[PDB]
Amino acid sequence: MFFINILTLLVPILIAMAFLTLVERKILGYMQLRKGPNIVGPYGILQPFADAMKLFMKEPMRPLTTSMSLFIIAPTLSLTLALSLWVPLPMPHPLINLNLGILFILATSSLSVYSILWSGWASNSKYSLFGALRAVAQTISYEVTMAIILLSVLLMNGSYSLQTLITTQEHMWLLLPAWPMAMMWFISTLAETNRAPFDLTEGESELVGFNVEYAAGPFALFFMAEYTNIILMNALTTIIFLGPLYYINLPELYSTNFMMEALLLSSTFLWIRASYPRFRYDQLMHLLWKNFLPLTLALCMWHISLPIFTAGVPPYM
Amino acid sequence: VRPRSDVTHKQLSAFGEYVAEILPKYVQQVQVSCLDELEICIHPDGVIPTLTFLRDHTNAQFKSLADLTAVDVPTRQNRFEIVYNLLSLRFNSRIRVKTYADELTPIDSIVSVHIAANWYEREVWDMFGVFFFNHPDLRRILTDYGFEGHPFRKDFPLTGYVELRYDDEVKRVVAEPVELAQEFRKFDLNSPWEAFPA
Amino acid sequence: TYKYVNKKEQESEVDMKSATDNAARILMWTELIRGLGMTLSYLFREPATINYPFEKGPLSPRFRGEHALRRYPSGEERCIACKLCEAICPAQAITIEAEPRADGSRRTTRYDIDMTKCIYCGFCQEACPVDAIVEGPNFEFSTETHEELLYNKEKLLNNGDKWEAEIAANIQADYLYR
Amino acid sequence: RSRAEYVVTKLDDLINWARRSSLWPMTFGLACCAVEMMHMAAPRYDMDRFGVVFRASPRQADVMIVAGTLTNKMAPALRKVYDQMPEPRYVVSMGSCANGGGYYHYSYSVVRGCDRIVPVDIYVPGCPPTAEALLYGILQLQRKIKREQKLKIWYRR
Amino acid sequence: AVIPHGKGGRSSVSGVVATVFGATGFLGRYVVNHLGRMGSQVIIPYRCDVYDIMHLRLMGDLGQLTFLEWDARDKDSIRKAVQHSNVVINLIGREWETRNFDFEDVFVNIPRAIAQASKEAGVERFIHVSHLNASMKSSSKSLRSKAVGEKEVRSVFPEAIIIRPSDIFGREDRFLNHFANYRWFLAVPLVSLGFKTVKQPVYVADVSKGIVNATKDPDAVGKTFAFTGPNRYLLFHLVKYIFGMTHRTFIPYPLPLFVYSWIGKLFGLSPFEPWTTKDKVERIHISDVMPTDLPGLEDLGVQPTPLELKSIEVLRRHRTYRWLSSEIEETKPAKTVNY
Amino acid sequence: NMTLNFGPQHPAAHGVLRLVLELSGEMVRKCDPHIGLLHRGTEKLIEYKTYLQALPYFDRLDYVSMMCNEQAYSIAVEKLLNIQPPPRAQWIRVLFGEITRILNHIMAVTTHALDIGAMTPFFWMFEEREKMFEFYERVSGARMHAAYIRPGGVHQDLPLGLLDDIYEFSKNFSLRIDEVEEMLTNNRIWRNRTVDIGVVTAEDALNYGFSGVMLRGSGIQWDLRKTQPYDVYDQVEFDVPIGSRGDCYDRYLCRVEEMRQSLRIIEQCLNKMPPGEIKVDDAKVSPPKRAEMKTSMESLIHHFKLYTEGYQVPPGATYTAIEAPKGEFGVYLVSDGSSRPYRCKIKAPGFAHLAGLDKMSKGHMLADVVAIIGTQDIVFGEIDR
Amino acid sequence: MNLYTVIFINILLSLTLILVAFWLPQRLPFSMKFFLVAITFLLFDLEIALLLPLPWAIQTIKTSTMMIMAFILVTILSLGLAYEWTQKGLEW
Amino acid sequence: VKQDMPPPGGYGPIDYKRNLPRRGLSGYSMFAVGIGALIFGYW
Numbered sequence A: 001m002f003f004i005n006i007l008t009l010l011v012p013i014l015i016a017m018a019f020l021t022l023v024e025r026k027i028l029g030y031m032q033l034r035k036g037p038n039i040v041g042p043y044g045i046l047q048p049f050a051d052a053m054k055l056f057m058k059e060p061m062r063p064l065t066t067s068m069s070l071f072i073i074a075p076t077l078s079l080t081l082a083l084s085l086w087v088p089l090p091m092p093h094p095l096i097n098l099n100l101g102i103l104f105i106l107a108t109s110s111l112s113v114y115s116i117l118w119s120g121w122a123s124n125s126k127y128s129l130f131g132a133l134r135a136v137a138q139t140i141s142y143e144v145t146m147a148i149i150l151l152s153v154l155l156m157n158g159s160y161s162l163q164t165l166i167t168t169q170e171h172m173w174l175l176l177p178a179w180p181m182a183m184m185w186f187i188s189t190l191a192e193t194n195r196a197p198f199d200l201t202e203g204e205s206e207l208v209g210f211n212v213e214y215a216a217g218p219f220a221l222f223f224m225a226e227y228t229n230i231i232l233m234n235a236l237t238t239i240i241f242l243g244p245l246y247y248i249n250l251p252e253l254y255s256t257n258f259m260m261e262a263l264l265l266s267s268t269f270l271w272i273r274a275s276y277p278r279f280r281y282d283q284l285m286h287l288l289w290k291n292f293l294p295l296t297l298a299l300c301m302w303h304i305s306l307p308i309f310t311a312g313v314p315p316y317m
Numbered sequence B: 001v002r003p004r005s006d007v008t009h010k011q012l013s014a015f016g017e018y019v020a021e022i023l024p025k026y027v028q029q030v031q032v033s034c035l036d037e038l039e040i041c042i043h044p045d046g047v048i049p050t051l052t053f054l055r056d057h058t059n060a061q062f063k064s065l066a067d068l069t070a071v072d073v074p075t076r077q078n079r080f081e082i083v084y085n086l087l088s089l090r091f092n093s094r095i096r097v098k099t100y101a102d103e104l105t106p107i108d109s110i111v112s113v114h115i116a117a118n119w120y121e122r123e124v125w126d127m128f129g130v131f132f133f134n135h136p137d138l139r140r141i142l143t144d145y146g147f148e149g150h151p152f153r154k155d156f157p158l159t160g161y162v163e164l165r166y167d168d169e170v171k172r173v174v175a176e177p178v179e180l181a182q183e184f185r186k187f188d189l190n191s192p193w194e195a196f197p198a
Numbered sequence C: 001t002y003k004y005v006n007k008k009e010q011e012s013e014v015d016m017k018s019a020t021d022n023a024a025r026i027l028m029w030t031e032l033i034r035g036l037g038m039t040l041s042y043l044f045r046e047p048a049t050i051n052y053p054f055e056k057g058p059l060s061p062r063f064r065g066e067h068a069l070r071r072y073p074s075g076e077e078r079c080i081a082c083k084l085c086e087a088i089c090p091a092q093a094i095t096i097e098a099e100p101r102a103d104g105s106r107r108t109t110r111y112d113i114d115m116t117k118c119i120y121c122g123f124c125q126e127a128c129p130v131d132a133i134v135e136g137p138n139f140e141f142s143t144e145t146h147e148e149l150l151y152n153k154e155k156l157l158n159n160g161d162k163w164e165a166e167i168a169a170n171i172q173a174d175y176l177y178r
Numbered sequence D: 001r002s003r004a005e006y007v008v009t010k011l012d013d014l015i016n017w018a019r020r021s022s023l024w025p026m027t028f029g030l031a032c033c034a035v036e037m038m039h040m041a042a043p044r045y046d047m048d049r050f051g052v053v054f055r056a057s058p059r060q061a062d063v064m065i066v067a068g069t070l071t072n073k074m075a076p077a078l079r080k081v082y083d084q085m086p087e088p089r090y091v092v093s094m095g096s097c098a099n100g101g102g103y104y105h106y107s108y109s110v111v112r113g114c115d116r117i118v119p120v121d122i123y124v125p126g127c128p129p130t131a132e133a134l135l136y137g138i139l140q141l142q143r144k145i146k147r148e149q150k151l152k153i154w155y156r157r
Numbered sequence E: 001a002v003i004p005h006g007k008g009g010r011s012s013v014s015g016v017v018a019t020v021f022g023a024t025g026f027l028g029r030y031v032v033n034h035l036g037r038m039g040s041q042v043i044i045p046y047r048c049d050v051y052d053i054m055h056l057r058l059m060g061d062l063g064q065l066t067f068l069e070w071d072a073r074d075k076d077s078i079r080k081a082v083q084h085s086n087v088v089i090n091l092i093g094r095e096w097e098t099r100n101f102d103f104e105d106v107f108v109n110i111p112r113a114i115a116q117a118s119k120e121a122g123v124e125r126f127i128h129v130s131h132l133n134a135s136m137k138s139s140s141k142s143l144r145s146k147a148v149g150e151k152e153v154r155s156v157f158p159e160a161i162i163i164r165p166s167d168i169f170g171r172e173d174r175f176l177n178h179f180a181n182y183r184w185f186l187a188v189p190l191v192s193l194g195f196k197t198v199k200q201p202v203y204v205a206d207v208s209k210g211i212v213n214a215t216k217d218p219d220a221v222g223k224t225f226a227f228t229g230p231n232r233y234l235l236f237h238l239v240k241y242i243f244g245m246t247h248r249t250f251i252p253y254p255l256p257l258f259v260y261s262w263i264g265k266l267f268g269l270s271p272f273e274p275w276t277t278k279d280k281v282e283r284i285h286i287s288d289v290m291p292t293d294l295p296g297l298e299d300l301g302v303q304p305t306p307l308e309l310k311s312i313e314v315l316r317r318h319r320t321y322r323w324l325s326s327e328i329e330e331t332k333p334a335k336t337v338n339y
Numbered sequence F: 001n002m003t004l005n006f007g008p009q010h011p012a013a014h015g016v017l018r019l020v021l022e023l024s025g026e027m028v029r030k031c032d033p034h035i036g037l038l039h040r041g042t043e044k045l046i047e048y049k050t051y052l053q054a055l056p057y058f059d060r061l062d063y064v065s066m067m068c069n070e071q072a073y074s075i076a077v078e079k080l081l082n083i084q085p086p087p088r089a090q091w092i093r094v095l096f097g098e099i100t101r102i103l104n105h106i107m108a109v110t111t112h113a114l115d116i117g118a119m120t121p122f123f124w125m126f127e128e129r130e131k132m133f134e135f136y137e138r139v140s141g142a143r144m145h146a147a148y149i150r151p152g153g154v155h156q157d158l159p160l161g162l163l164d165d166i167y168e169f170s171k172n173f174s175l176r177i178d179e180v181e182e183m184l185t186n187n188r189i190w191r192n193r194t195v196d197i198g199v200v201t202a203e204d205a206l207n208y209g210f211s212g213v214m215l216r217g218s219g220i221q222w223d224l225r226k227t228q229p230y231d232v233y234d235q236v237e238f239d240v241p242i243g244s245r246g247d248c249y250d251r252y253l254c255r256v257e258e259m260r261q262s263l264r265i266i267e268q269c270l271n272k273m274p275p276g277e278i279k280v281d282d283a284k285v286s287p288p289k290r291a292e293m294k295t296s297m298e299s300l301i302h303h304f305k306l307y308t309e310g311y312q313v314p315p316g317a318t319y320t321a322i323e324a325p326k327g328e329f330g331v332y333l334v335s336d337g338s339s340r341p342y343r344c345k346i347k348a349p350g351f352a353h354l355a356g357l358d359k360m361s362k363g364h365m366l367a368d369v370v371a372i373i374g375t376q377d378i379v380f381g382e383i384d385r
Numbered sequence G: 001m002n003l004y005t006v007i008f009i010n011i012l013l014s015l016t017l018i019l020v021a022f023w024l025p026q027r028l029p030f031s032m033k034f035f036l037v038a039i040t041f042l043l044f045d046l047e048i049a050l051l052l053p054l055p056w057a058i059q060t061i062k063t064s065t066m067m068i069m070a071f072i073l074v075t076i077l078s079l080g081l082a083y084e085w086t087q088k089g090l091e092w
Numbered sequence H: 001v002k003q004d005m006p007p008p009g010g011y012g013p014i015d016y017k018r019n020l021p022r023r024g025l026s027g028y029s030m031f032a033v034g035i036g037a038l039i040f041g042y043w
């Protein structure tokens, strides 16, 4: 039965991963006055499966100058961490509820920065190394504010367990309070998934770095990873800040609304991509260290003070 | 028949005399075409001096270099005819200063007078082979890295002498003497009858 | 007449109201939200794409497309080998050699348009006195092998016979203009 | 149906469909034919609909469309990019400049065709080969990819 | 015939219309290269899908290379291929007896039918290629079967040239790559510790040029040339040398062949192109025969090219980033054995 | 300095560009652009081709502004022949010249964004661009590479429905500029990527021979369309959009304004196009009409000679510059009395601009260089010629 | 264990893909800025640590000391940032 | 006689100037919205 549940979480998520790609190629399309992929299958539903098969069949190329492990470990790690982070998520019931759940999600995300570092060193070509170094920096920087923004949340939730927020948000979303950080969580979620406004990790016009030497099966695995993440981080926004209504008698309206909010915020980063030009490498770090980190550290203190003098210290457990 | 204003053919003509007078050491001929265009002609040594006077003279400011080109009249002893076309945004007029250079008698470079010429002078060396002294970095611009011969010279075959194909044996692109599958049909077009006195 | 773009006519001194409006613009990304609205708007517009095989992008009569050699209604090929179509071709594409046919008429023994050499200028359409060589409407003649693209008299005459009905309609529509 | 032959015919039909449906092209971008495809990528004749990627790096590209003249200075590169593309790979030569030398055939700086440099699968004709015309050529590549029977040949080899 | 006009390069004519049935091969690729360079008309019968023969298209010029669909079991396909050719070159061969084709077929059965038709057609000359040192009694079924063929084809086609090349040295060859690829194997077995099986490699091009020159020379009729090489080698130096350029450790450990023929049997069972072959193994330890015979290279006009000279290009792909820049001069040469 | 080349295949390299960059860290200290990857021999081939059969070559030098390019050759050859195009033809060349500047600017603004990372502006305008080519195709038969503007006059009269269709496109086009206007002109992300990048001072721009929006962007007031009015640019009213400071933003804003100003010029041309002939009536220069050559001997002789031999323009030389969308496009045509030219130096606004990349991209990141090439609107056909 | 079960399936799923992916088909880039960032990053990462126990420390009976401590930590690091800005650091 | 020409009286007028609309909520009012959310949310 546990395996059944393991399958129920991973298989559906992976399929959702696939169709996000399709949805990204139609919502971007209609925004740009074009139908998008509808000719393969009915309305393009078979389109995600089609290139998956093309990608796996095409010859995986191992560059003459390339490590053969820091090359194959990197996509395996990227898919493994991203699919793994869906293990401890309240929907509303988590598969493996962990008392220090949010620290698990923060730690597992942090490990993905390596895959970028390992792939860049493994390729042994200049475009890859330059891209990886800037990339690791972006990801790491957007971790420092990412973590502090969560610590502010937790202090108003009382615990690290993601399951507690379902009881914290039984009367109001944590967006109303703490909206200023939501925005800053959303922008940081956009950076950590290397999506558009912050896609310098792999700029195309700039260094066509992460998958330069990655084609076919390796390309796919990170690829899959990114999109699953795209969902996971959006889903974490939909639990931590937008709290779906929870009724203990019927648990699925929680998941039904979790479904609706996650899809809309997942739709939002698709909409962000088409709408904005990409930021400069330093313009990106200028935002986090200058614009956001002082806002986050100060609002972090406000969230240690709001509890005490408003006699609202949250109940542990 | 095009409309022609003689106001210009007079203005430009006068200027020509003015330039000539101011720079008599180098100006050999100064003509105005029937198309109202002035074309001071200078000894090759006057390249630096004549340009500078035009770039920096209150009564003749010719700030930008429209173009530097070299017609090649093979008959002419001095094969190339370096032509510099300049524009004066202040006086809304253009002038052309043209000099003569043979294959192995280099011309001075004007990169100092106008930095626009940094590239065009490299273009003239690559295509025609004229050399420009004091050029910051003269090196082929348009032709292939290993190209031998100056292409726009009238004595260079259009198709050229080398063409490229990929050879499997050597797994690398390889020049071979040009072998064309339909030679350029050289239609003779000149008519045996003249048009006017000109 | 000139026009300054990006020239600030004067120094509006900050007024709290102004400052707030601005600070709000930086803090709550107001203009960024403006941009998102524009793309959401089109998402709702009808897409302009056409089903390519089923629907075709419109081409009017002068479209040059693919070369064809026409024939008189009687059945006598129009070309009389004056060979100025060869003379005015910019790319040297058309190769024509001729000899007096048995009938005694002038005709081309070999007419070869190298389509890879041709740059579809449409001057040949222009130059022909009998208008034997025409720019036919078809643009879809992509070929697996390079040799197929080279076209001799028989392919062009066959191309002419296949598309004669539309070529005649197209020339009918545009001849007054020429 | 039951026959090791039928299973091997159906499965390539599957393998061929995947390659056919998702061709990620890589355009070098020489001369002007690249524009006449930027029009194919554009809304009147979307290519994505057909499963075509607007921009794909060489290592992730199934099809190379050579648009424009291949000069004798870009030849040594085209071959490199063709050589560095993943194995399943196809070339579409667009423009009379690329499939044959076109205007500029007799030039000393232009390779008379990309077929001399890279093996070419479909030749799309026209000075600016029309954008439908490229789309017909890409669709002709898809007809060529459907006909290929790699698994059948391995079975009866 | 076709009077030879031109300057000598592509887009020129040499007048050799030649069916070449096994062109897709490693040797083949080279044969079509020169034939195409010279300007000869080359008909390439092929069975593999068009995708795989694309590499042959750019070779040769337009309308100079023609590809025909052909099946070995179907006699009619061979019939039409040689219809309009005046030179037929046979390079049909394999190392692994495939499910539907036996060594006899690939070497003796098929290469007969082919020359047989060629005669019916009236082709001026047929060149048949069989492996070097091929006794009708040689151990490897392959070599013996090949020997069987060179005899037969002479009765189907008299005065048919029979070049008999040694194992070939070239990029994409086996002789050189096989050993270099033993890297995956931690240890590199070598029967008799790689001794007493002196081997003389021959560059592929030399072989190709030689073959081509045959097509355009009256001196070769019924000749059984033997393209051999510029220097012989005990398998030991060869193996190490290879590993030397590849810059990968060399660990020669002797392996009793009786057991090794079994290893060949193992990979041989592989469905997808067994990497080693029982018939291979024997061949590898089958000593190169001595050079007393109608000479090949040089005799046919090409001076052999030493192995060390081009080895760098063949073995480069097997090096690691660390050694990629390394050059031949840095490395040492192997030693020959006039024995 | 970690030398790295911006190799041709990369999308930001316009297909052919090998910018040898010296990366002092991510900051780039020197650029040595290696053009020549698309040199076709355009100017050595023209010497072997008659004046009409060399027109087509001029549609392929800058391949995004075809007709304005072929208006520079047409004006040159016309000068050397002391012939002037008929009144209707001159308006048609100005009508098609501004459709080309809208077409080039949609190319330059949207592809610049494609390089920076904004993808939607390209798709919205490119649909508006095929609407425009249709106008080329409906008047010449070629979507691009028309050959419509002939050395004397233009080739064929406008079809009877084109001016109504050009009104409907121009009527609704401005909203389309307004729409990318909102999506890419105030985005802090665009401004940051474009503002204060590649500033070029006024005197430096004149000295480097920039001569284009690059000249106007830094505040120098020069438009060959008003200063030296070619064709009818003396009878149409427009405002040159001079920018103030020179950052890549002011240059973008200028390009967006010129699209708007061109709609003002297109409006005037549709409102005031004269009834008349489209090509000069001298059979010696412009080919005789199809009916005339098939009924009058003097016309067949003139058609035969013009197509087979040529105009035989009188001996002379001229440099004629027109304001092509990129900048000043000029042809220095030297002519012997022969029907085929002797020299044709195509001045390319772009050979000068690309030279400026090293000076303009000073103290700038790898990413800034992508913007610097984008703001020069460089098409390598014109530079390589 | 339950987690172990999930994770090994997770690695298995990824190793399966790469394996099929490889089986079905049948020098001196340095800028102190980059190093400097990494450093700053840990100085901040360590601080994140000293700040992580704050959810448990909220419930501490003291409260006054808690906040007095936490506010001092956040303020002193932020000043570190302040000097990073003031100095060329953070100015890439 | 019949040639493609502007309609009699000329065509209508075409807009070229930017028509970007300055439509938005005033800044003070805007701040209040977010501030109010926080103020209430905290309570």
Ligand SMILES: NC(=O)C1=CN([C@@H]2O[C@H](COP(=O)(O)OP(=O)(O)OC[C@H]3O[C@@H](n4cnc5c(N)ncnc54)[C@H](OP(=O)(O)O)[C@@H]3O)[C@@H](O)[C@H]2O)C=CC1
Pocket: E021, E022, E023, E024, E025, E026, E027, E028, E046, E047, E048, E072, E090, E091, E092, E093, E094, E095, E101, E105, E106, E129, E130, E131, E132, E164, E165, E166, E167, E168, E173, E174, E175
């Ligand atoms: N080291 C060497 O290479 C040596 C080779 N030789 C001889 O030279 C010849 C060429 O060798 P090489 O090129 O390496 O051989 P390959 O393994 O490269 O194959 C040669 C060609 O034969 C074709 N072929 C093989 N089996 C069949 C079949 N049953 N029906 C139809 N065609 C077939 C193949 O076509 P496809 O792949 O399409 O089936 C291939 O193109 C061989 O015959 C060999 O006996 C002699 C001495 C040394």
Ligand SMILES: COC1=C(OC)C(=O)C(CC=C(C)C)=C(C)C1=O
Pocket: D027, D028, D029, D030, D031, D032, D034, D035, D038, F011, F012, F013, F014, F015, F107, F108, F111, F112, F114, F115, F378, F379, F380
């Ligand atoms: C508009 O300027 C140019 C581009 O950049 C946006 C290019 O991408 C390209 C080529 C691009 C590809 C890959 C189609 C060309 C030719 C060009 O002119």
Ligand code: SF4
Pocket: C078, C079, C080, C081, C082, C083, C084, C085, C086, C096, C127, C128, C129, C130, C131, C132, C133
């Ligand atoms: S012009 Fe017309 S008629 Fe004269 S040859 Fe060319 S095609 Fe035949």
Ligand code: SF4
Pocket: C119, D030, D031, D032, D033, D067, D068, D069, D094, D095, D096, D097, D098, D102, D103, D126, D127, D128, D129, F060, F063, F145
């Ligand atoms: S083919 Fe015609 S269009 Fe394509 S590049 Fe050569 S010239 Fe430009």
